Structures are given as C-alpha cells and as structure tokens.
C-alpha cells in the first residue's frame, strides 16, 4: 500500500521544484517549512530554498527571523534558505536598471513577479538544488501555475502586435525560457505539488477541485497532508470528540478518494508552531508517520 | 514489486481516476 | 465599545461591506453570517453576497450552487449570492479571450467590473439592483491588491469611453472612502500569525482611507468555562489580551469554535446571532453543540 | 453622551493610534511581545 508519509519526497534526488498549496489557513506555511527542514536535514550536501509566493508573507513570522527579497540562510541550518518576494523592490530595481509604483500594485503583479523569479533560476541553470514554494491560497496559486501557458500565448500575441505596429530576439529568449519551465513543471520526477487540507467539507471539496485542475495542467500530485487532526479517540472534551467525529467522517472519504496518494495525517498541536526548534519537531511526522498512541506527548512539547 | 514498479503503477492509477468522466464523478461523490 | 456588529447589521447607509483577513480564519463563514443578520433585520432591502475569492466557497457554505448571475439563497427572500467564473463571464461578453481568462489579476478585474456595473445600474435607476453588497474576500495579500485598484487605476488613466471609465473609477473611490457607505470588517483568530497580519492589513486599509471599525475574533475556545483545549486557550487568551488593548477603539466581536463546521442556512443563521448579540460562554455554551446537518 | 458623539469620538481615537509613529509602535508591540 501507499506509505502515509513524505519520506520518498524528502529523500528525492530528482525533484527541483516542490509546491506546497491548498486552502487558506490549512497549514501551507507550517508544512512547507517542515518539508524544507526535513529535506535539508536529510540531504546535507544539497542546497534548498524555500520561497514564499503568498503576497502576505509568513516565512519570517514562522521562523521568527527576518527574510526578504534576497535569499538568506535560516539560522541554525547549513543548507536551507528563505526568500520572500518583494514587489516594490523588484520594480524599483527594474525601473532603476532601465510607473514602477503604479504597476507595483496591479492585481496579478505578485504572480508575475514570482514567475519572473522562477525564470531567473532557469537562466542560471544554464545555485540551489531544489526550490520549495510556500504558495498563496488555492485560487491565486492556480493563476501562477497557469502562467507558462498564459505567457507563451501573450508573448505570441505581443509579437503579432509588434509586426502590425512596425526585439524578436528577446521574445524568443523569453518564450524559450517559458518552455523550459513548462517542461520542468510537467515532469513528475522534477516537480510535484503537495496539497495541504483540513478534514472539513470546505477544505476537502476545494482540495479535490484543485487537484483536478493540477492534473489537467499535467502537474504531478501524489501527496496530501491532512493537518490539524484531533485524534480524539486517543481525557478529551465534548467539543474535541464531536469535532473529531466530523474529522473522521471526512477522513474516511479522503482515504477512499486518495487511496493512490501518500496521505499524511498531522495532529493539531497544543499551541502554534513557530521557530526552528518547534517546526523541526513537528516536521519529523512528515518523514515518519505520527502515531497517536506513541507520539501523543509531542503535541504538548512546543 | 520494485520501487520503480510501484511508482509507475500508482502514477497510472492516480491518472486513471481523473480520466474520462472520473473527475466529474469524484465531485458528485463529495457533494 | 459594544462587542457586536449590531450598528452595522442595522445600518441604513452602507452599500459596500468588505469582510477580510488571513486565510482560513472564517471570512466566508462570517460574511454569510453578517449577510443573514442584515437580511433578517432589513426585509425591505435586498442584499447581495459576492465572493471575490477565486477559490469560491459560498456554494459550499450554503450547500447549493451559485454562479456569475445572482441567485437567491434558498429559504431567504432578500439574500442572494454571486460567484464569478472569469472564463464564463468573458465568454458571455464575447458572445454579447481565454488568454484573458487565466491572466493573473483577471479575478480582481472582473470583481471590479461587477462593482462598476452595480454603480451604473443604480445611477440609471434600474429597478432591480441590490441595496447592499457584502464582499466575501480572498485572503489578505490579494484583497489588498483589489482594494488598491481604485487608486492604482485612477493613476494609470474611444478615448471618451476611456474617460467614462475614469469617472467610474472616481465614483468608486469616493464611495469606498466614505464611512457611511463602505466599511471593512476584519476577521482573525487569536494566534500570532493572524494577529500580526490583521494589524498590518488594518494599517494598509486606513492608509487607503477605508473605514475599519470592527474585528471578529473567531474560533475561540473559552476553555475556562481536556489538556489540548486548556493549553490552546492559554495561547488564545494571551493574544486576546493584546487584541483587547490594540483594538479598544473597535467593535471586537468574539466568536466560539463550534463543535463542527458551520454549513447550511440554519447553522449559519444560528452562528450569526452572536454577531448581533455578543456570545456569552456561560449562557450560550449549549449552542456550540446545536449544529444540524 | 449620545451615540453620534460616541461614534465620532471612537473614530477620532482609531485614527490617532495610527498617526505619528503610532503605526510602527503598534507593530513593535506585537512582534516585541511574541516569542
Ligand atoms: N498542526 C498544527 N497544530 C497547531 N497549530 C498549527 C498546525 N498547523 C498550522 N498551525 C497554526 O495554524 C495557523 C495557520 O497555519 P499556517 O501555516 O499560517 O497556514 P497557511 O500558510 O496555509 O495560511 C498558524 O497560526 C500556525 O501556527
Ligand atoms: N467558529 C467556527 N466554529 C467551527 N468551524 C468554523 C468556525 N468558523 C469557521 N469554521 C470552519 O472553518 C473552516 C474555515 O472557515 P472559512 O469560512 O472557510 O474561512 P476563510 O473564508 O477565511 O477561508 C471552514 O471549514 C468553516 O466551516
Ligand atoms: F481559505 Al479562505 F476564504 F476559503 F481564506
Ligand atoms: F492564511 Al495563509 F498562507 F497565511 F493561507
Ligand atoms: Mg501561509
Ligand atoms: Mg472563504
Ligand atoms: Zn478539547
């Protein structure tokens, strides 16, 4: 059967691009920090970068130290770095190196700038060995992941306007770069999308639709983290027991819907999970599955 | 089953579940 | 400052009510609840709940299917919902562009067009528009881009029909910056990530001259009246003490974590009462267990 | 103190908290007090 953990991914020697996504507030940032820590600890000789594409960044807030537009090592890690894409700065730099304010607040500019960052890595490919993306909630991340296509068409159309309105070299460079990205993003050994959800109707239904959308783009998804589980069958109050009954109802559907996926069940801990120490502690259960009987005390150990 | 065999099998099974009208069916079973 | 939204629920001036905050805090749940309360309180008025989250949840919340064209909520006479599918909307305009249907920002562009459409219908005395629109917004970062749009666009700006858009942008900017007409209700949970994000969000909104005077603190345990719950309440209480101080000039509405998800008109209605008359853990405790299916 | 007077007082108070370095001060209060 399908191991209920991310060990295969954590030990992958092929993946270059790992997206962590799903509904708002389900634990994308927490999980993406966790996966990254596990990858860096499991593969000491490789360099990892965790990039936030959520315009409302939380990497700094989760680790409790200051990251920004320039990649920077996580304090206490030899081989993990974080970057929080900064649009103001990014556009300020473009303006200097060649308005930048007014386009700096245009809806879509965040996804545009995030993708541009991907393009820079590709061009240096020809660094970090693997990039993990802590993505924006579902709706806007799908727009980002549509970019390779949206973009090749826009560039084609842009070239048509130019022919009519009397440079081809740069369009081709741009198009070639987009193509490399599309090729890599649709290669199962190079990129995967790990979904995060909670065991509730709104999250489950959104996760299924997200996954269908991803598969239709030929993006790989083989892993789902189900977060914030109560495991109240393992001194639990009336509220916890009723809520766990709900969680189990959806967990049963999840087990059937995603029987072909790694389904990784993670506990709600007795506090928020912040700082390297606590994130690492939590992260162990992505590698070796949480067992409520034996590991139960860890949720109080923050 | 080898590591590589299991990987290809699951890939195919995951894919098959969304093929044809699989996706639409999955949505209905959720709703 | 009363710990409820009663003043907003019974307002006779508001046309635009945004509901926002960090992901998963309860924007959709709260916006439904606020909308239900207003519709129940003002039967003579028609309310539209619109989702600007591209990953729509209004249909999932109520358990019936909505779309780009307004449809009344089953069991209400004066509450409707809207969820725009950019690909459909654009196809209808084309009939009346798949490039554009998946361009990042297209969601905020169409949400904005809908607002402009409503403004125009009203200025033109069309008999069937809504009195008040409640926005169930996307999580913080993109909702700020949306709210930045009136100004960003205002700067950016056949050419006549260009300046016709100019005048509409200005009309929206005028209304969004009028505290009688427009307000933004923050939703948060009592945890550091959400707290810090909420304060930054509010500082941005105020810099836009958008009114913010109310905050919903959701998913509260109130455990002082199970070791996990006891420890998590201690955490929530620590941030709750900060919230009380920070937002002492705001309506701070404290909502309980219920013993299940809140879906369907009946359950959302039952939850919503506590936006109008503040929840009392000792008195109303039983209610968190009264959700149906 | 009528509701109109109170509404106006609260509004002035809210705005003042975000004026004159009060904004950065509030942020420091949140981060400064966090673990
Ligand atoms: N399993 C968990 N147990 C306890 N707290 C959690 C867990 N997963 C996430 N959190 C907390 O819940 C909140 C939302 O998680 P977060 O990673 O910010 O979500 P997302 O990035 O998807 O918005 C944060 O306050 C985080 O500390
Ligand atoms: N006070 C509450 N008690 C129980 N469940 C809640 C409460 N508030 C929200 N929910 C549930 O929590 C999840 C997130 O709420 P939701 O409204 O989708 O969030 P947001 O719209 O901010 O993403 C949903 O499954 C919803 O039913
Ligand atoms: F995850 Al949401 F609105 F559905 F923040
Ligand atoms: F609310 Al988030 F990533 F911080 F969905
Ligand atoms: Mg996050
Ligand atoms: Mg929502
Ligand atoms: Zn409990």
XYZ file of C-alpha atoms and ligand atoms in Angstrom:
728
model
C 0.000 0.000 0.000
C 0.827 3.706 -0.099
C 3.037 4.885 2.772
C 1.320 7.633 4.860
C 4.366 9.893 4.814
C 6.546 12.063 2.584
C 9.735 10.028 3.046
C 10.130 9.379 -0.695
C 9.900 13.096 -1.446
C 12.073 14.137 1.497
C 14.796 11.792 0.173
C 14.225 12.581 -3.506
C 17.383 13.183 -5.513
C 15.452 14.261 -8.623
C 12.984 16.969 -7.582
C 13.864 20.577 -8.376
C 10.506 22.249 -7.768
C 8.136 21.462 -4.899
C 4.912 23.388 -4.496
C 3.018 23.308 -1.232
C -0.542 24.530 -1.665
C -4.187 24.384 -0.693
C -6.969 26.332 1.022
C -6.316 29.337 3.252
C -5.113 28.697 6.788
C -4.770 24.915 6.460
C -1.041 24.947 7.196
C 0.747 25.587 3.909
C 3.397 27.749 5.559
C 3.834 25.389 8.512
C 4.122 22.352 6.185
C 6.366 23.947 3.606
C 8.741 24.987 6.407
C 8.516 21.445 7.711
C 9.193 19.714 4.360
C 12.106 22.043 3.674
C 13.674 21.400 7.074
C 13.269 17.672 6.524
C 14.830 17.860 3.063
C 17.776 19.937 4.253
C 18.381 17.617 7.236
C 18.042 14.514 5.098
C 20.279 15.810 2.301
C 23.185 17.719 3.930
C 25.119 18.116 0.680
C 22.317 19.856 -1.220
C 21.230 23.484 -1.025
C 17.499 24.177 -0.546
C 15.496 27.386 -0.982
C 12.003 27.957 0.401
C 10.255 30.767 -1.494
C 7.022 32.405 -0.381
C 4.667 33.376 -3.198
C 1.908 34.471 -0.814
C 1.805 38.276 -1.150
C 1.061 38.243 2.581
C 4.380 36.623 3.549
C 4.729 34.487 6.681
C 8.160 32.812 6.391
C 9.839 35.479 8.555
C 6.949 35.270 11.022
C 7.056 31.468 11.174
C 10.817 31.197 11.671
C 10.962 34.346 13.813
C 13.780 35.968 11.862
C 13.982 38.441 9.001
C 13.942 37.228 5.394
C 13.378 39.450 2.354
C 13.868 39.811 -1.392
C 17.350 38.327 -1.223
C 17.674 34.671 -0.237
C 19.161 34.223 3.221
C 20.159 31.190 5.307
C 17.801 30.020 8.055
C 19.639 30.493 11.377
C 20.621 27.037 12.583
C 20.661 25.431 9.114
C 23.664 24.926 6.835
C 21.689 24.229 3.672
C 18.219 25.867 3.874
C 17.380 29.447 2.831
C 14.177 31.513 2.648
C 13.165 34.282 0.254
C 10.088 36.486 0.465
C 9.432 38.026 -2.937
C 9.303 41.814 -2.659
C 7.332 43.594 -5.452
C 8.140 47.195 -4.514
C 11.860 46.429 -4.502
C 11.646 44.217 -7.581
C 10.004 47.014 -9.585
C 12.233 49.697 -8.072
C 15.210 47.702 -9.323
C 13.729 47.270 -12.810
C 12.975 50.987 -13.006
C 16.497 51.873 -11.877
C 18.051 49.323 -14.246
C 16.125 50.723 -17.228
C 5.391 53.850 -13.363
C 7.098 51.177 -11.272
C 4.864 52.315 -8.402
C 1.562 52.049 -10.229
C 2.335 48.626 -11.713
C 3.587 47.604 -8.267
C 0.000 47.444 -7.023
C -1.738 45.973 -10.074
C -3.576 42.725 -9.254
C -1.566 39.892 -10.786
C 1.796 41.566 -10.213
C 2.555 39.143 -7.386
C 2.130 36.064 -9.543
C 4.015 37.804 -12.329
C 6.969 38.600 -10.073
C 7.054 35.137 -8.544
C 7.239 33.597 -12.004
C 9.976 36.024 -13.037
C 11.930 34.681 -10.071
C 11.494 31.152 -11.439
C 12.768 32.424 -14.801
C 15.945 33.785 -13.212
C 16.798 30.353 -11.752
C 16.252 28.684 -15.128
C 18.652 31.135 -16.773
C 21.262 30.438 -14.078
C 20.613 26.723 -14.581
C 22.269 27.453 -17.923
C 22.592 27.881 -7.261
C 20.105 25.984 -5.128
C 19.445 22.350 -5.966
C 15.782 22.377 -5.029
C 13.196 25.095 -4.538
C 10.187 24.722 -2.264
C 7.306 27.140 -2.776
C 5.139 28.212 0.115
C 2.237 29.291 -2.127
C -0.710 31.648 -1.863
C -4.064 30.088 -1.046
C -5.619 27.988 -3.805
C -7.334 30.484 -6.094
C -4.334 32.646 -6.886
C -1.814 29.787 -6.965
C -3.729 28.218 -9.889
C -3.225 31.509 -11.758
C 0.502 31.263 -11.062
C 0.605 27.653 -12.241
C -1.272 28.599 -15.437
C 1.419 31.188 -16.310
C 3.615 29.031 -18.555
C 0.624 28.731 -20.896
C -0.934 32.152 -20.374
C 2.520 33.587 -21.033
C 3.563 31.763 -24.193
C 0.295 32.986 -25.740
C 0.685 36.575 -24.549
C 4.247 36.658 -25.906
C 2.997 35.280 -29.229
C 0.277 37.941 -29.310
C 2.771 40.601 -28.282
C 4.893 39.645 -31.312
C 1.854 39.929 -33.587
C 1.084 43.470 -32.311
C 4.708 44.425 -32.949
C 4.568 43.162 -36.546
C 1.430 45.229 -37.128
C 2.736 48.351 -35.349
C 6.137 48.433 -37.075
C 13.169 42.630 -30.209
C 12.146 39.406 -31.908
C 15.348 38.092 -30.357
C 14.208 38.849 -26.836
C 10.708 37.499 -27.356
C 12.270 34.220 -28.409
C 14.551 34.186 -25.384
C 11.508 34.820 -23.196
C 9.456 32.145 -24.966
C 12.291 29.621 -24.780
C 12.580 30.268 -21.037
C 8.835 29.771 -20.506
C 9.053 26.492 -22.437
C 11.846 25.155 -20.244
C 9.697 25.954 -17.204
C 6.627 24.261 -18.676
C 8.764 21.217 -19.493
C 10.203 21.014 -15.986
C 6.895 21.753 -14.235
C 5.226 18.899 -16.133
C 7.987 16.408 -15.394
C 6.875 14.179 -12.461
C 10.435 13.447 -11.348
C 11.351 17.159 -11.299
C 8.221 18.804 -9.898
C 5.399 17.837 -7.582
C 2.607 19.732 -5.832
C 1.941 18.686 -2.227
C -1.609 19.613 -1.156
C -2.467 20.633 2.404
C -6.010 20.433 3.774
C -8.061 20.070 6.932
C -10.687 17.409 7.386
C -13.732 19.606 6.748
C -16.118 19.935 3.817
C -14.914 23.314 2.598
C -11.272 22.255 2.517
C -11.914 18.771 1.098
C -14.028 19.950 -1.829
C -11.599 22.744 -2.643
C -8.700 20.290 -2.481
C -10.370 17.844 -4.925
C -11.059 20.645 -7.425
C -7.506 21.990 -7.028
C -6.084 18.531 -7.679
C -8.265 18.017 -10.758
C -7.158 21.386 -12.053
C -3.496 20.493 -11.414
C -3.730 17.120 -13.119
C -5.333 18.813 -16.132
C -2.227 21.015 -16.386
C -0.111 17.838 -16.293
C 1.254 18.838 -12.894
C 2.137 15.912 -10.626
C 0.383 15.455 -7.291
C 0.898 12.298 -5.291
C 0.881 13.685 -1.747
C -1.670 15.233 0.574
C -1.078 16.492 4.098
C -4.207 16.413 6.254
C -3.433 18.875 9.032
C -4.821 19.893 12.448
C -6.349 16.479 13.226
C -7.667 15.862 16.738
C -7.304 12.055 17.000
C -9.696 12.380 19.986
C -10.113 8.615 20.243
C -6.530 8.584 21.503
C -9.348 12.912 28.590
C -10.877 14.585 25.528
C -13.684 17.121 25.979
C -17.182 17.078 24.431
C -16.093 19.605 21.803
C -12.997 17.661 20.716
C -14.977 14.438 20.468
C -17.737 15.937 18.343
C -15.172 17.701 16.117
C -13.133 14.503 15.783
C -16.284 12.684 14.727
C -16.569 15.263 11.935
C -12.911 14.993 11.031
C -13.202 11.194 10.848
C -16.214 11.395 8.581
C -14.131 13.347 6.050
C -11.019 11.304 6.776
C -12.971 8.229 5.608
C -13.805 9.937 2.293
C -10.213 11.118 1.984
C -8.965 7.553 2.461
C -11.086 6.368 -0.481
C -10.643 9.414 -2.748
C -6.875 9.480 -2.321
C -6.027 5.801 -1.854
C -3.399 6.168 -4.595
C -1.719 9.131 -2.857
C 0.548 9.494 0.146
C -1.943 10.737 2.742
C -0.003 12.200 5.670
C -2.066 12.779 8.804
C -0.774 15.506 11.147
C -2.018 16.374 14.679
C -3.298 19.704 15.962
C -0.644 20.689 18.500
C -1.320 22.401 21.862
C -0.030 25.709 20.523
C 1.009 27.486 17.327
C 4.133 26.053 15.651
C 6.859 28.683 15.265
C 10.657 28.856 15.376
C 13.174 26.344 14.009
C 13.036 24.060 17.040
C 9.271 23.542 17.073
C 8.957 23.374 13.287
C 11.621 20.654 13.231
C 9.859 18.689 15.980
C 6.571 18.843 14.072
C 8.332 18.112 10.752
C 9.516 14.685 11.889
C 5.970 13.397 11.343
C 6.077 14.094 7.614
C 9.031 11.694 7.423
C 7.872 9.078 9.923
C 4.069 8.998 10.312
C 2.502 10.302 13.508
C 1.233 7.539 15.750
C -1.331 8.960 18.218
C -0.653 6.191 20.744
C 3.112 6.546 20.849
C 3.813 10.144 19.741
C 0.926 11.869 21.526
C 3.092 13.761 24.024
C 4.898 15.666 21.293
C 1.898 17.958 20.753
C 2.490 19.397 24.242
C 6.234 19.745 23.706
C 6.260 23.130 21.980
C 7.137 -5.029 -6.653
C 10.265 -2.936 -7.082
C 10.431 0.704 -6.084
C 10.227 1.803 -9.724
C 7.331 -0.566 -10.473
C 5.203 0.665 -7.579
C 5.859 4.259 -8.643
C 4.675 3.731 -12.227
C 1.636 1.761 -11.089
C 0.421 4.435 -8.658
C 1.079 7.179 -11.196
C -1.150 5.304 -13.641
C -3.869 4.599 -11.076
C -3.955 8.221 -9.891
C -4.205 9.322 -13.506
C -6.912 6.786 -14.334
C -9.192 8.098 -11.563
C -9.424 11.506 -13.249
C -9.620 10.152 -16.829
C -12.777 10.406 -18.935
C -15.624 11.243 -16.561
C -13.697 10.205 -13.466
C -13.220 13.786 -12.296
C -16.906 14.681 -12.616
C -17.827 11.501 -10.759
C -15.451 12.296 -7.907
C -17.067 15.711 -7.444
C -20.558 14.193 -7.180
C -19.481 11.661 -4.559
C -18.154 14.564 -2.495
C -21.346 16.614 -2.968
C -17.363 49.865 22.568
C -20.059 47.209 22.235
C -18.671 43.748 21.388
C -21.021 43.205 18.452
C -21.900 44.300 14.905
C -25.419 45.487 15.750
C -24.771 49.006 14.434
C -23.564 47.632 11.113
C -26.311 44.999 10.786
C -28.988 47.688 11.195
C -27.213 50.369 9.130
C -29.321 52.292 6.645
C -26.363 53.838 4.831
C -23.916 51.057 3.950
C -23.736 49.885 0.321
C -20.353 48.130 0.430
C -19.215 45.846 3.223
C -15.915 44.031 2.895
C -15.064 41.037 5.058
C -11.377 40.188 5.104
C -8.312 38.780 6.844
C -5.822 35.900 6.786
C -6.640 32.559 5.149
C -8.988 30.144 6.884
C -9.908 32.468 9.743
C -13.613 32.470 8.800
C -14.199 35.180 6.147
C -16.770 33.100 4.237
C -18.436 31.895 7.439
C -18.572 35.450 8.833
C -19.653 37.136 5.615
C -22.592 34.710 5.267
C -23.432 35.362 8.901
C -23.293 39.135 8.579
C -25.379 38.935 5.381
C -28.007 36.723 7.016
C -28.281 39.082 10.002
C -28.737 42.116 7.732
C -31.345 40.426 5.525
C -33.287 39.265 8.587
C -33.040 42.751 10.103
C -33.968 44.594 6.925
C -36.655 42.649 4.975
C -37.421 45.695 2.836
C -33.895 45.694 1.424
C -32.133 43.354 -0.983
C -28.671 42.037 -0.150
C -26.030 40.520 -2.418
C -23.168 38.424 -1.067
C -20.341 38.282 -3.596
C -17.264 36.089 -3.391
C -14.056 37.714 -4.611
C -12.036 34.658 -3.536
C -11.193 32.984 -6.897
C -11.427 29.721 -4.944
C -15.129 30.230 -4.178
C -16.778 28.787 -1.061
C -20.233 30.408 -0.908
C -21.797 27.450 -2.714
C -20.023 25.063 -0.310
C -21.061 27.104 2.722
C -24.775 27.129 1.878
C -24.758 23.773 0.130
C -26.229 24.899 -3.164
C -24.788 26.112 -6.436
C -24.216 29.775 -7.199
C -22.630 31.433 -10.206
C -21.846 34.655 -12.027
C -25.522 35.614 -12.106
C -27.158 36.398 -8.774
C -29.403 33.732 -7.253
C -31.437 33.984 -4.040
C -30.352 31.829 -1.118
C -32.923 29.051 -0.575
C -35.065 29.993 2.425
C -34.411 33.746 2.140
C -36.401 36.328 0.152
C -33.796 39.058 0.261
C -30.341 37.468 0.262
C -28.536 36.403 -2.899
C -25.075 35.066 -3.729
C -22.659 35.535 -6.614
C -19.501 33.639 -7.596
C -17.912 34.792 -10.859
C -16.224 32.257 -13.146
C -13.937 34.588 -15.160
C -13.887 32.150 -18.095
C -17.678 32.157 -18.309
C -18.105 35.893 -17.805
C -15.598 36.561 -20.587
C -17.290 34.108 -22.941
C -20.647 35.832 -22.354
C -19.099 39.230 -23.053
C -17.523 37.770 -26.180
C -20.895 36.410 -27.289
C -22.763 39.590 -26.337
C -10.253 35.734 -24.647
C -9.094 32.506 -22.990
C -5.850 34.411 -22.888
C -7.504 36.868 -20.539
C -9.497 34.272 -18.596
C -6.394 32.920 -16.888
C -4.247 36.059 -16.635
C -3.233 36.676 -13.033
C -5.343 39.599 -11.813
C -8.285 38.768 -14.078
C -10.235 37.848 -10.942
C -9.803 41.251 -9.338
C -10.512 42.897 -12.711
C -13.889 41.174 -13.077
C -14.821 41.678 -9.418
C -14.114 45.364 -10.017
C -16.202 45.396 -13.191
C -19.112 43.955 -11.218
C -18.840 46.833 -8.780
C -18.767 49.298 -11.649
C -21.787 47.563 -13.170
C -23.722 47.963 -9.928
C -22.825 51.651 -9.611
C -24.051 52.272 -13.168
C -27.358 50.397 -12.710
C -28.076 52.485 -9.615
C -27.171 55.816 -11.250
C -29.524 54.843 -14.054
C -32.444 53.998 -11.783
C -32.728 50.362 -12.739
C -35.490 48.965 -10.536
C -33.725 45.705 -9.708
C -30.351 46.179 -8.078
C -29.287 45.341 -4.571
C -29.219 47.867 -1.754
C -26.148 46.459 -0.078
C -23.298 44.242 -1.259
C -21.173 42.182 1.118
C -17.812 41.011 -0.190
C -16.513 37.631 0.891
C -12.905 38.429 0.030
C -9.796 36.406 -0.728
C -7.080 36.132 1.950
C -5.214 39.351 2.845
C -2.499 39.771 0.240
C -4.722 39.718 -2.847
C -7.603 41.538 -1.190
C -5.202 44.470 -0.704
C -4.436 44.458 -4.440
C -8.158 44.576 -5.086
C -8.713 47.491 -2.717
C -5.653 49.255 -4.160
C -7.277 49.081 -7.588
C -9.436 52.229 -7.492
C -6.344 54.336 -6.851
C -3.841 52.344 -8.883
C -6.271 52.565 -11.773
C -7.063 56.209 -11.057
C -3.379 56.948 -11.627
C -2.957 54.672 -14.653
C -5.632 56.589 -16.550
C -12.954 55.928 -27.968
C -10.821 57.897 -25.505
C -14.090 59.349 -24.278
C -15.200 55.866 -23.281
C -11.774 55.730 -21.629
C -12.547 58.774 -19.510
C -16.009 57.334 -18.869
C -14.126 54.591 -17.037
C -12.155 57.338 -15.328
C -15.350 58.845 -13.917
C -16.486 55.433 -12.719
C -13.166 54.789 -11.006
C -13.555 58.119 -9.233
C -17.130 57.313 -8.201
C -15.956 54.030 -6.657
C -13.042 55.717 -4.920
C -15.493 58.296 -3.495
C -17.806 55.603 -2.123
C -15.108 53.244 -0.829
C -13.622 56.115 1.156
C -16.968 57.185 2.662
C -17.510 55.651 6.132
C -21.310 55.891 5.801
C -21.168 53.934 2.561
C -18.305 51.463 2.992
C -16.647 49.529 5.786
C -14.153 46.694 6.118
C -14.722 44.030 8.752
C -11.580 42.155 9.726
C -11.684 38.515 10.741
C -8.857 36.882 12.683
C -8.030 34.037 15.020
C -6.190 34.567 18.281
C -2.730 33.390 17.132
C 0.425 35.372 16.288
C 0.405 34.888 12.515
C -3.183 36.053 12.231
C -2.818 38.895 14.749
C 0.248 40.410 13.086
C -1.257 40.013 9.634
C -4.514 41.657 10.785
C -2.738 44.698 12.224
C -0.741 45.145 9.004
C -3.934 44.757 6.972
C -5.720 47.407 9.043
C -2.754 49.808 8.776
C -2.932 49.435 4.979
C -6.720 49.918 4.809
C -6.558 53.041 6.924
C -3.800 54.378 4.687
C -6.300 53.884 1.822
C -8.903 55.946 3.720
C -11.022 52.835 4.069
C -13.068 52.688 7.251
C -12.269 49.870 9.641
C -14.107 49.873 12.975
C -14.905 46.209 13.710
C -12.953 42.975 14.160
C -14.319 39.444 14.541
C -12.142 37.105 16.626
C -13.212 33.646 15.560
C -12.716 30.024 16.611
C -12.291 30.892 20.285
C -12.197 28.026 22.785
C -13.284 29.806 26.020
C -11.927 26.736 27.822
C -12.029 28.178 31.359
C -15.760 27.518 31.145
C -9.031 18.374 28.061
C -5.357 19.267 28.155
C -5.129 20.267 24.500
C -8.031 22.704 24.807
C -6.672 24.073 28.076
C -3.238 24.735 26.564
C -4.665 26.197 23.334
C -6.974 28.517 25.310
C -3.985 29.814 27.261
C -2.385 30.714 23.943
C -5.585 32.305 22.603
C -6.003 34.285 25.830
C -2.512 35.721 25.558
C -3.270 37.163 22.103
C -6.799 38.083 23.155
C -5.262 40.319 25.837
C -3.207 42.043 23.118
C -6.272 42.355 20.885
C -8.332 43.976 23.650
C -5.642 46.631 24.072
C -4.847 47.217 20.385
C -8.446 47.421 19.275
C -10.035 49.047 22.287
C -11.485 51.672 19.919
C -13.026 48.957 17.725
C -16.022 46.647 17.941
C -14.309 43.383 18.936
C -16.696 40.506 18.374
C -15.616 37.232 19.971
C -16.972 34.072 18.340
C -16.736 30.488 19.670
C -15.220 27.499 17.913
C -18.254 25.291 17.293
C -18.388 21.501 17.698
C -18.485 21.089 13.912
C -18.270 23.016 10.645
C -20.896 25.691 10.026
C -22.768 24.991 6.792
C -26.289 25.476 5.533
C -28.694 28.326 6.197
C -29.916 27.020 9.559
C -26.447 26.547 11.082
C -25.062 29.815 9.722
C -28.164 31.607 10.964
C -27.656 30.097 14.415
C -23.990 31.162 14.482
C -24.835 34.619 13.151
C -26.955 35.669 16.131
C -23.724 36.176 18.069
C -22.602 38.900 15.687
C -25.712 40.810 16.726
C -25.872 39.973 20.430
C -22.475 39.032 21.883
C -21.856 35.382 22.750
C -21.794 34.576 26.469
C -19.870 31.368 27.137
C -21.671 30.700 30.414
C -25.116 31.420 28.997
C -24.902 30.337 25.382
C -22.450 27.469 25.848
C -25.020 24.888 24.751
C -25.279 26.454 21.289
C -21.886 25.285 20.005
C -23.392 21.778 20.145
C -26.677 22.602 18.364
C -25.483 22.448 14.750
C -27.586 20.276 12.436
C -26.602 18.603 9.143
C -23.043 61.013 25.596
C -25.195 60.386 22.518
C -24.402 57.616 20.018
C -23.499 60.278 17.461
C -20.965 61.854 19.834
C -19.517 58.461 20.824
C -19.274 57.345 17.190
C -17.303 60.496 16.435
C -15.018 60.134 19.471
C -14.206 56.496 18.689
C -13.459 57.361 15.089
C -11.008 60.122 16.026
C -9.358 57.778 18.532
C -8.892 54.973 15.996
C -7.262 57.318 13.504
C -4.944 58.823 16.110
C -3.494 55.431 17.095
C -2.115 55.069 13.564
C -0.747 58.604 13.313
C 2.707 59.936 14.220
C 4.811 56.791 14.535
C 1.913 55.137 16.355
C 1.699 52.675 13.482
C 5.271 51.388 13.796
C 4.909 51.451 17.559
C 1.870 49.135 17.352
C 3.766 46.684 15.137
C 6.722 46.686 17.559
C 4.297 45.942 20.363
C 3.052 42.834 18.528
C 6.433 41.460 17.385
C 8.262 42.636 20.510
C 5.903 40.679 22.740
C 5.982 37.474 20.656
C 8.305 34.502 21.259
N -0.931 21.083 13.097
C -0.952 22.311 13.716
N -1.090 22.386 15.082
C -1.163 23.625 15.636
N -1.112 24.830 15.034
C -0.982 24.737 13.678
C -0.895 23.497 12.927
N -0.755 23.765 11.557
C -0.760 25.103 11.452
N -0.889 25.744 12.703
C -1.080 27.118 13.046
O -2.332 27.496 12.432
C -2.214 28.766 11.773
C -2.334 28.634 10.249
O -1.220 27.904 9.763
P -0.360 28.463 8.541
O 0.835 27.660 8.241
O -0.187 30.021 8.625
O -1.298 28.385 7.267
P -1.433 28.702 5.735
O 0.064 29.130 5.470
O -1.962 27.656 4.879
O -2.170 30.093 5.795
C -0.841 29.358 12.199
O -1.107 30.113 13.358
C 0.003 28.110 12.565
O 0.865 28.335 13.656
N -16.362 29.382 14.720
C -16.264 28.239 13.962
N -16.528 27.021 14.531
C -16.376 25.926 13.744
N -15.994 25.850 12.452
C -15.740 27.067 11.914
C -15.841 28.333 12.607
N -15.521 29.395 11.754
C -15.217 28.822 10.574
N -15.349 27.413 10.619
C -14.970 26.408 9.681
O -13.547 26.598 9.495
C -13.194 26.464 8.113
C -12.612 27.779 7.594
O -13.666 28.738 7.590
P -13.942 29.643 6.311
O -15.133 30.498 6.434
O -13.818 28.761 5.015
O -12.678 30.564 6.102
P -11.994 31.677 5.245
O -13.233 32.004 4.309
O -11.406 32.804 5.953
O -11.030 30.900 4.298
C -14.474 26.036 7.348
O -14.432 24.625 7.288
C -15.617 26.529 8.278
O -16.783 25.743 8.279
F -9.278 29.654 2.750
Al -10.401 31.008 2.511
F -11.574 32.305 2.245
F -11.587 29.885 1.846
F -9.235 32.069 3.291
F -3.526 32.314 5.610
Al -2.202 31.626 4.673
F -0.795 31.028 3.792
F -1.086 32.509 5.714
F -3.340 30.743 3.648
Mg 0.986 30.783 4.650
Mg -13.534 31.962 2.260
Zn -10.893 19.530 23.997
